[PDB]
Structure formats: C-alpha cells, structure tokens
C-alpha cells in the first residue's frame, strides 16, 4: 500500500506495490480494469498508466499479482492536482537531496525509471530554465560544478514519456541542499597505543578530515567487549582534523589481568585496525 | 558476536531509498523515490571483522531491516530474502563491505564471490560481475 501523485495534463505511471515477474499476471481496480489501452487510464502489467492524469482520477487503485501459488495484493493511494500558477512547486513533490560544492554535483530526476524516455531532459530551478556552462545536464541527472551555498533550491525536471508514439509531458521536483564541508577519510589509524606493555589506559585513533558517517574507536577485552570484574569499564571523549578516543579504566589490579590481550580497535567503512597492549 | 551495531538509511547511486515493508507474513523491498520529509527506513548494520585484508582487515556486516529479521542472500535465485532465525546467523546473511569514495558502499556475498547485492528493474537483487551503489545515513 504506497502513495503516488502528480499534476493534470501529465503522464503518470504507477508501479504495483507487491512485486513479481513478467508472466506472473497482475490485475487492477478502482471503484476489472483495461489491460491495454482504454485510451487514458489503463494498466500494463505491474504498471498502472494514466495518459494523461486528471484530478478526477484520484482514488485508491488496488492491484493483484497472481502466481497462482499466491495472490499477493497491494494498493496505490493516488492523487492528481491542478497547477496553481503559484510558479513555486508546493512541498508535495519528491524529496530533498544534498551535495558538495564542486565536491558533489549530481541531481537525479525522480521516478524517471518508471517512464519511457529516449530524450535529453529540461531542468528548471524555481521556474528558471537552466543553461550555460556551470549547469550541464546528462542522462537522468543534472551536474552542477559551480555549487556554492547559492544553488540551494527546488530543482524540477521536465521530460517526455512516449507510449505508442504518443508524447506526454511529465515533471518532477525535489529540493537541493549544499553540504558545507566535504571531507575525506581513510583506513583508521591508532595514535595510541602502539603494540605495547603497560604495568588509567587509553586508545585514540584517527579516521580522516571530514565528519564520518561511521567512525568508532572502542576497547575489546580478550577479543570480546564484556568479561568483567567490577572493572574493566569503558569511557569516551571528543575533541579540520577528525580523530576519536576511548579510555579504559581499572582501579584494582588482580592476577587474571596478566594473561590475555587488551585490544584497542578503530573501525571505519574502510576496515578495522587493532592494537594490542599488555 | 558483532563488534558494533548502528542504524543507517540505505540509498542507491541515483538516490532512490531502499525501503522495506513487512506484511508481517511476507514482505516487499522497494527501490523508490520517497516524498519530502517522509522518514526513511533505518536498518541495523552489524559489523564483524573478516580476515579479508586491506590497507589490515576489512569488515563484513549483517543488515536487520527490523525486529529479528536479517537479509538472507538466495544463491541460485539471485535474490535477497528476509528470514527470522533466532539461530546463530548463517553465511548467506553476511556481506563483505567495500569502500571506494565516501559512504558509497557495496556488499559482496561471504559465501559466493563476485556476487553483490545490487539493483535490477527497480527491485533489490544479486549481481554477478556501478549498479552496486549504496549510500548510508
Ligand atoms: C487467487 O489465487 C487463488 C488461490 O491461489 C485462486 O484460487 C483464485 O482464483 C485467485 N483469486 C480469486 C478469488 O479470483
Ligand atoms: C518508448 O519509446 C520508444 C521511442 O521513444 C517508442 O518507439 C516505444 O513505442 C515506446 N515504448 C512503449 C511501447 O511504450
Ligand atoms: C513527440 O511525439 C511526436 C508525435 O509523433 C513526435 O512527432 C515527436 O518527434 C516526439 N518528440 C520527440 C522529439 O521525441
């Protein structure tokens, strides 16, 4: 059961929520639907098509996929709108997308996969057709190399879905956000310790320049986190440099503490680095 | 025995979100553009250490979409499936991580080489070898 939307005069294809194959066989219903070409609204396989969509067409359109070792069934909540000459696409179309300055350039045109398009498409930032050097559009996306914090805005792409040779107009809009700093990262590096003996202990490792999706330094004990007397116990901290640290704590030494490894670890998406103390 | 476990959003090269849906008996997995401010399905990546090297040893991971379910990789059928299995997790639940540019990752089957979770016809499937494209959040 998945929602879908679009304007009047525009083509809209809608995929059936429960998935399956060609030769698995799908049916659609409104409020028993044309399988090919009742000339405006009809359904080909998993794809409910509206050519073009009108507001009257809003409703729930249920669908059923049949194996027949099963009949899976799933619905499409659907709404079609009147363009308001606001010139500003209202907050309901698609979803926000970020980028670096020159550091990431790419805005994808939503839902385009659903449609049949052999052409180069048009982009518009807040009712202003893009052009020139800085904006260069290719395939299904838009590449902006110029990007400042100035390219924040709602980008809308128009393209054409062609059916039997009938051309229809489709558009989609989404917001674009510029990432303040885009930093790098590499395999983690443990400043402290080296492989070494102690006889209050600490581990610091360093993962890159930026702010990491995933960076963690953590203490393992005999290669597990959890074997316990009242101690060991683990504690953290935080400081264009990006590095993390974790401190062990042990108040009272005991004998067991001689045998088995105290393992500092730093991990990343790049992988894991471990050091051993004793 | 995972080393750490964190939630992250999943998304493709072209920025489609990978959503999960559990009809609680069977399921669906979507690769599709969401609506602004619609929250994204977060999945638990649990990170284990492969002896697969790097520079060192690179991680693998298992993804719980939710509440005691994981991503099982179906070999001959080139598919991703969802399983319950309280039991200690099997080899098709595991994926060697790979990292090229930032956050941009691909998942290779611990069991059978050169086969990655990837995307085909707007569905999630397995690929034998740019269509293995995942961002995290
Ligand atoms: C759906 O499949 C069932 C059982 O597999 C089949 O017998 C039936 O014809 C289908 N649904 C209906 C009521 O048409
Ligand atoms: C898709 O577009 C091609 C060329 O634009 C056209 O020839 C074809 O009929 C279309 N496919 C269908 C059947 O929708
Ligand atoms: C759109 O459809 C019309 C009708 O046949 C066709 O003549 C035209 O070339 C199509 N536009 C393009 C350039 O794809």
For the domain that residue B136 is a member of, what is the CATH number?
2.80.10.50
Task: For A184-278, give the CATH class.
Answer: mainly beta
Q: Which domain holds residue B44?
A: 1-137
The count of CB pairs under 8 A between chains A and B is 91
Residue A111, chain B, CB below 8 Å: the answer is: yes
Within 10 angstroms of residue B32's Cβ, the number of other Cβ atoms is 19
Q: Three-state secondary structure along chain B?
A: CCCEEEEEEEECCCCCEEEEEECCCCEEEEEECCCCCCCCCEEEEEEEEEEEECCCEEEEEEEECCCCCEEEEECCCCEEEEECCCCCCCHHHCEEEEECCCCCEEEEECCCCCEEEEEECCEEEEEECCCCCEEEC
Q: Where in chain A is the domain with CATH 2.60.40.10?
A: 1-88, 89-183, 184-278
- For A89-183, CATH gives 2.60.40.10
Which of A17, A185, A272 faces B28 most closely, judged by CB atoms?
Answer: A17
Is-contact A71 A147, C-beta < 8 A?
A: no
Partner-chain contact A95 B54, CB within 8 Å: no
Residues of B in contact with A5 (CB under 8 A): 35
Partner-chain contact B49 A216, CB within 8 Å: no
Method: X-ray
- Side-chain half-sphere exposure of A270, counting CA atoms within 13 A: 19
Angle among Cα B98, B101, B103 to the nearest 5 degrees reads: 70
Which of B4, B6, B34 faces A218 most closely, judged by CB atoms?
Answer: B4
Residues 21-80 of A with CB under 8 A from B: 72, 74
Q: Which CATH architecture has domain A1-88?
A: Sandwich (2.60)
Within 10 angstroms of residue B137's Cβ, the number of other Cβ atoms is 13
Q: In residues, how long is chain B?
A: 137
A106 CB-contact burial (10 Å; exposed 0-12 / middle 13-18 / buried 19+): middle
- Choose from B7, B18, B30, B33 for mutation: most chain A CBs within 10 A: B33
Distance from C-alpha of A63 to C-alpha of A27, rounded to nearest angstrom? 5
DSSP bridge partners of A237: A245
| Chain B residue whose CA is closest to A266 | B3
Contacts of A20 (CB under 8 A, 6+ apart): A26, A46, A65, A67, A72
Residue A162, chain B, CB below 8 Å: the answer is: no
Distance from C-alpha of B20 to C-alpha of B42, rounded to nearest angstrom? 9
A75 CB-contact burial (10 Å; exposed 0-12 / middle 13-18 / buried 19+): middle
Residue A213, chain B, CB below 8 Å: the answer is: yes
Q: Pairing state of beta strands B17-22 and A167-178?
A: unpaired
Residue A3, chain B, CB below 8 Å: the answer is: yes
Distance from C-alpha of A146 to C-alpha of B51, rounded to nearest angstrom? 43
> How many distinct structural domains can be found in chain B?
1
Identify the residues whose C-beta falls under 6 Å from ligand 2: A 116, 118, 162-165
Which resolution in angstroms does this entry have? 3.3
Partner-chain contact A267 B102, CB within 8 Å: no
Dihedral over alpha carbons B35, B38, B43, B45 (to 10 degrees) = 80
Contacts of A174 (CB under 8 A, 6+ apart): A93, A94, A95, A96, A97, A107, A110, A154, A155, A156, B36
Residue A141, chain B, CB below 8 Å: the answer is: yes
Distance from C-alpha of A6 to C-alpha of A12, rounded to nearest angstrom? 7
- Closest ligand 1 atom to A69 CA: 5
């Amino acid at each position: 059961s998945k929602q879908s939307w679009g304007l009047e005069n525009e083509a809209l294809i809608v995929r059936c929520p429960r998935q399956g194959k060609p030769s698995y066989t799908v049916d659609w219903y409104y409020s028993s639907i044309p399988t090919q070409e009742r000339n405006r609204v009809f359904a080909s396989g998993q794809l409910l098509k509206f050519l073009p969509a009108a507001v009257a067409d809003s409703g729930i359109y249920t669908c059923i996929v049949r194996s027949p070792t099963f009949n899976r069934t799933g619905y499409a909540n659907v709404t079609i709108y009147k363009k308001q000459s606001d010139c500003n696409v209202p907050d309901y179309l698609m979803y926000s997308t970020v980028s670096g300055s020159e550091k990431n350039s790419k805005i994808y045109c939503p839902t385009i996969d659903l449609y049949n398009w052999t052409a180069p498409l048009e982009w518009f930032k807040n009712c202003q057709a893009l052009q020139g050097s800085r904006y260069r559009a290719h395939k299904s996306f838009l590449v902006i190399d110029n990007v400042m914090t100035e390219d924040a805005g709602d980008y809308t792409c128009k393209f054409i879905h062609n059916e039997n040779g009938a051309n229809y107009s489709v558009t989609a809009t989404r917001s674009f956000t510029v990432k303040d700093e885009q930093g790098f990262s590499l395999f983690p590096v443990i400043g402290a310790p080296a492989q070494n003996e102690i006889k209050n202990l600490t581990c610091s490792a360093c993962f890159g320049k930026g702010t990491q999706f995933l960076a963690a330094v953590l203490w393992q004990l005999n290669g597990t986190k959890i074997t316990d007397f009242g101690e060991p116990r683990i504690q953290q901290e935080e400081g264009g440099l990006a590095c993390l640290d974790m401190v062990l704590r042990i108040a009272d030494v005991k004998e067991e503490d001689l045998l088995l490894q105290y393992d500092c670890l730093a991990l990343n998406l790049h992988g894991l680095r471990r050091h051993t103390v004793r | 025995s995972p080393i750490t476990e964190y939630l992250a959003s999943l998304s493709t090269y072209n920025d489609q979100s990978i959503t999960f849906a559990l009809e609680d008996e069977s399921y669906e997995i979507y690769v599709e553009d969401l609506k602004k401010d619609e929250k994204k399905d977060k999945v638990l990546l649990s990170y284990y250490e492969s002896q697969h090297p790097s520079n060192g040893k690179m991680l693998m991971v298992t993804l719980s979409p939710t509440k005691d379910f994981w991503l099982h990789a179906n070999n001959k059928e080139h598919s991703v499936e969802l399983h319950k299995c309280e039991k200690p997790l099997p080899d098709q639940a595991f994926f060697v991580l790979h990292n090229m540019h930032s956050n941009c990752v691909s998942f290779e089957c611990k069991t059978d080489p050169g086969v990655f979770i990837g995307v085909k016809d707007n569905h999630l499937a397995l690929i034998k070898v740019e269509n293995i494209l995942f961002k995290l959040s």
